[PDB]
């Protein structure tokens, strides 16, 4: 129901107020708006990313930090959308050729002590984890779709800007044609195809993280993640 969207709106507002109001310093010396300033400078440099500290977020509002730890996938996109809002209201107006607002990648770092690869057990699935290791392999950079549009082969009925879930998860095309009547033919079994010219894609990479040599139990080979 739309009460979930109400919850999303208020949580996005709280992330926006974190990025709008957080300061570092003291009244004896002076204050700087850390994340506003980083957003402004990175956007003007054409970087379109910031890195947020979990302890800063927890000091501002500990519930948001707890939500990010427990349910990072759900709340990180709200944080990124709030970052996009703050970037807009921090950089507006922009010169010609920069009118269209860009998406902001929000990265995370923390002062917390890390876990091992062998600490990752089924209780922690979908939770936010911090682990060390060595990069032993790295793939070529490739394209992952973030937005697609799909068109029906019979009636040319189109679904636009389908949100693609991040990560190695894919997307299921609809089994039957959407929103129009069961005419003749009703449906060929895959009615939809992905339109070639409308996809928005981002870079992605696959890497292998090896366990640290001093973390390995005696007699065992280092694990991979």
């Amino acid at each position: 129901a739309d009460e979930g969207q109400a919850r999303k709106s208020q949580l996005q507002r709280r992330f926006k107020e974190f990025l709008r109001q957080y300061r570092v310093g003291t009244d004896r010396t002076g204050f700087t708006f850390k994340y506003r300033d980083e957003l402004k400078r990175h956007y003007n440099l054409g970087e379109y990313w910031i890195e947020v500290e979990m302890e800063d977020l927890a000091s501002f509002d500990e519930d948001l930090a707890d939500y990010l730890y427990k349910q990072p996938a759900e709340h990180l996109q709200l944080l990124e959308e709030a970052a996009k809002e703050v970037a807009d209201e921090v950089t507006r107006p922009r010169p010609s050729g920069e009118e269209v607002l860009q998406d902001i990648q929000v990265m995370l770092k923390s002062d917390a002590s890390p876990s091992s690869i062998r600490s990752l057990k089924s209780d922690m699935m979908s939770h936010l984890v911090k682990i060390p290791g060595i990069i032993i392999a790295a793939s070529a950079v490739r394209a992952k779709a973030t937005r697609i549009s799909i068109q029906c082969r019979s009636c040319r009925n189109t679904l636009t800007n389908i949100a693609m879930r991040p990560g190695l998860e894919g997307y299921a095309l609809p089994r039957k044609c959407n929103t129009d009547q069961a005419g003749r033919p009703k449906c060929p079994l895959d009615p939809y195809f992905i339109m070639p010219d409308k996809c928005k894609c981002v870079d992605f990479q696959t890497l292998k993280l090896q366990e640290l040599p001093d973390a390995v139990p005696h007699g065992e080979m280092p694990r991979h993640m």
């Binding site: 957080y22 300061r23 570092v24 310093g25 003291t26 009244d27 004896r28 010396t29 204050f31 979990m54 302890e55 800063d56 927890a58 000091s59 501002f60 500990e62 707890d66 730890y69 923390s110 002062d111 917390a112 002590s113 600490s119």
Partner: protein
């Protein structure tokens, strides 16, 4: 003589003058210096500040500066010796003395012209009357009076102890002037907490002084604030806390706090191999996961923390630790800066007694003094890291002493000695850190041993000091009973032994119960101490 009114007879006098501050190297002295600096900077009093780590460098600084200054202020030094004889001043200088050390020297008390004691008259003071101390059958009664004088004055000078915090005295001055800022109240709190952390006062007196400071905290918390009008996050908020006795536990893991706190380390006997299972039993009784307990406190799950203090108290009561809570204070400002008074005490103390060889002890004083101002929060956090290192080194040293059985009962008193070249001895070579080590080690020993006799003894500890001159630092500690009144006789016992043996004893530290001794004379010095305490 005692200053009756600090505003009228001390501050309004030195307000018009150039002043020289001699400041001792301890956190209470630093806090009093910060408060007095703030008042002088408000009034444009052209002061000069000199750190002094001992009597000889106090004498050196006075010899350097006596020509140019007529008004001197001694912070946590001078009250327990004859300053006139020590410094040999000109006839028309003035020495204001704000010092916690007791008993006050009788010459300091009854000097009515030159020595002015910034000491509260309602402290634990019992001065002998003037006629008992100062001027055929007539000469026979003269000799009898002199014998009675020796008896009475020994009874007066026997037990050394500490009175009200100098930071609290200077805060009362600031309050009377009505220039008492919230950071000045915080510095007063930190001075009292320094006294409590170093066990210089009884728990009753600490609770009474906390009761005094609570009212000032309430006044400052209602100067511009109530339940419906509130200030910026920039402003400092001091809050009364019935917090936990664990050390630095909001800045590292609860596991490290339980391991490196003196009380819980002593009770669980974590120096021993078996004690870690006792601690694990305590944590399992609480129901805290070990991963959360070993995680940093700020990164611990928030569902574990919002009743942690009463959970700790409830489990501690059924484990026999009946007083895990303590009445203390905290300061908040900004979004993320939060400190207990104990945290600030340990950070500043570590910055003073740092093991770093670069610079000098006065440079480390300067680092500690800077760290008490909020313009040097980086210095405060660096001090917190140094405090974590210091606490860990303290526990390793206690474990070494108890495991090797260096603590041997020398009849009247337990005896311990650090050895040159062993780990962290250079960190503990400084007398303040050595005093803290000896107190923590005595608590650990009393919890360790099963003999009823050993639980009541005092302790004497020695450590190397010098090889260019071949000397050791020796400290004396009273017994660690809960009934103790925190008074000790070792300041006078040491000099009685030293004069009985004609030992090469040097007496530079401001506490009489800490001495420097030639490494050869320690044998006969200890023999005299056993003979003396009997």
């Amino acid at each position: 003589m005692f200053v009756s009114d600090f505003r009228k007879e001390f501050y309004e006098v030195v307000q018009s003058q150039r002043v020289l501050l001699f400041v001792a190297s301890d956190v209470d002295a630093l806090c009093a210096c910060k408060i007095l600096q703030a008042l002088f900077q408000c009034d444009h009093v052209q002061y000069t500040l000199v750190p002094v780590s001992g009597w000889q460098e106090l004498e050196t600084a006075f010899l350097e500066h006596k020509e140019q200054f007529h008004y001197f202020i001694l912070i946590n030094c001078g009250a327990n010796v004859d300053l006139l004889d020590i410094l040999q001043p000109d006839e028309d200088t003035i020495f204001f003395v704000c010092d916690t050390h007791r008993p006050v020297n009788v010459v300091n008390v009854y000097n009515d012209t030159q020595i002015k004691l910034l000491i509260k008259q309602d402290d634990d003071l019992e001065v002998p009357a003037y006629e008992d101390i100062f001027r055929t059958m007539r000469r026979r009664q003269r000799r009898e009076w002199e014998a009675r004088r020796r008896d009475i004055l020994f009874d007066y000078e026997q037990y050394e102890y500490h009175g009200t915090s100098s930071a609290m005295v200077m805060f009362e001055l600031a309050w009377m002037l009505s220039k008492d800022l919230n950071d000045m109240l915080w510095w007063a709190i930190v001075g009292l907490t320094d006294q409590w952390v170093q066990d210089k006062i009884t728990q009753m007196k600490y609770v009474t002084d906390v009761g005094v400071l609570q009212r000032h905290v309430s006044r400052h918390n209602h100067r511009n604030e109530d339940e419906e009008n509130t200030l910026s996050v920039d402003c400092t908020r001091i809050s009364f806390e019935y917090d936990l006795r664990l050390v630095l536990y909001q800045h590292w893991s609860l596991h490290d706090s339980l391991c490196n706190t003196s009380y819980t380390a002593a009770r669980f006997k974590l120096w021993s191999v078996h004690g870690q299972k006792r601690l694990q039993e305590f944590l399992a009784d609480m129901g805290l996961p070990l991963k959360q307990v070993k995680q940093k406190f700020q990164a611990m799950d928030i569902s574990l923390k919002e009743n942690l203090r009463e959970m700790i108290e409830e489990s501690a009561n059924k484990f026999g630790m009946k007083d895990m809570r303590v009445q203390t204070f905290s300061i908040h400002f900004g979004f993320k800066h939060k400190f207990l008074a104990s945290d600030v005490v340990f950070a500043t103390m570590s910055l003073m007694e740092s093991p770093e060889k670069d610079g000098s002890g006065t440079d480390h004083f300067i680092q500690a003094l800077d760290s008490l101002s909020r313009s040097n929060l980086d210095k405060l956090y660096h001090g917190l890291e140094l405090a974590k290192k210091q606490l860990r080194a303290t526990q390793q040293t206690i474990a070494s002493c108890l495991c090797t059985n260096l603590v041997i009962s020398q009849g009247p008193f337990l005896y311990c000695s650090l050895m040159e070249g062993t780990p962290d001895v250079m960190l503990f070579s400084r007398p303040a850190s050595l005093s803290l080590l000896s107190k923590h080690l005595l608590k650990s020993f009393v919890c360790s041993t099963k003999n009823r006799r050993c639980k009541l003894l005092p302790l004497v500890m020695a450590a190397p000091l010098s090889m260019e001159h071949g000397t050791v630092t020796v400290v004396g500690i009273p017994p660690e009973t809960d009934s103790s009144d925190r008074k000790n006789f070792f300041g006078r016992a040491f000099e009685k032994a030293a004069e009985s043996t004609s030992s090469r004893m040097l007496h530079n530290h401001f506490d009489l119960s800490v001495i420097e001794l030639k490494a050869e004379d320690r044998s006969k010095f200890l023999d005299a101490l056993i003979s003396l305490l009997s």
